Design a protein around this ligand. Structure first.
Ligand code: NA
Ligand code: NA
Ligand code: NA
Length: 157
């Protein structure tokens, strides 16, 4: 009823490689809210702006017991370098095989260059304590986004 997106059951048990060398799974986050934001490329202007915006709001997400994960298909080492340079205090998922991206249907196609070109569309989701995807943002506008996600989380919580 409250879900806006249905994920395959296996999605919740995918091993997600994090910055810092550990793995997580979505099921491991049971019992608390989770914000998952997908972005196209480490260390680019929009992605850096978005990450810094979420980072600045961490205490507000903490107040709500929520955790955040950023996701792109960059490597663990790329993510480590990005986190260290920017001072991020939340993890980044190295979704190199785009398994998590496909589950959330964020790999979108565009007819460009006389080709069918597939890429990550900037998108964010709110996962309830019982693992339901209860809100989505697609084709994200970075300006104001993290603030809007926080407001929606508060409203839902
Ligand atoms: Na960087
Ligand atoms: Na959760
Ligand atoms: Na929406």
């Amino acid at each position: 009823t409250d879900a806006v997106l249905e994920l395959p059951a296996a999605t919740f048990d995918l091993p997600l490689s994090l910055s810092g060398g550990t793995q997580t799974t979505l099921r491991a986050h049971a019992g608390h809210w989770l914000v998952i934001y997908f972005y196209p490329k480490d260390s680019t202007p929009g992605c850096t702006t978005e990450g810094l915006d979420f980072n600045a709001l961490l205490p507000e997400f903490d107040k709500a017991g929520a955790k955040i994960l950023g996701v792109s298909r960059d490597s663990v080492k790329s993510h480590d370098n990005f986190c260290a340079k920017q001072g991020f205090a939340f993890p980044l998922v190295s979704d190199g095989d785009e398994a998590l991206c496909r589950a959330f249907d964020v790999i979108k196609e565009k007819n460009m260059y006389g080709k069918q070109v597939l890429g990550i569309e900037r998108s964010t989701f709110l996962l309830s304590p019982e693992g339901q995807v209860v809100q989505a943002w697609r084709k994200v506008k970075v300006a104001g986004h993290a603030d809007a996600v926080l407001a929606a989380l508060k409203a839902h919580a």
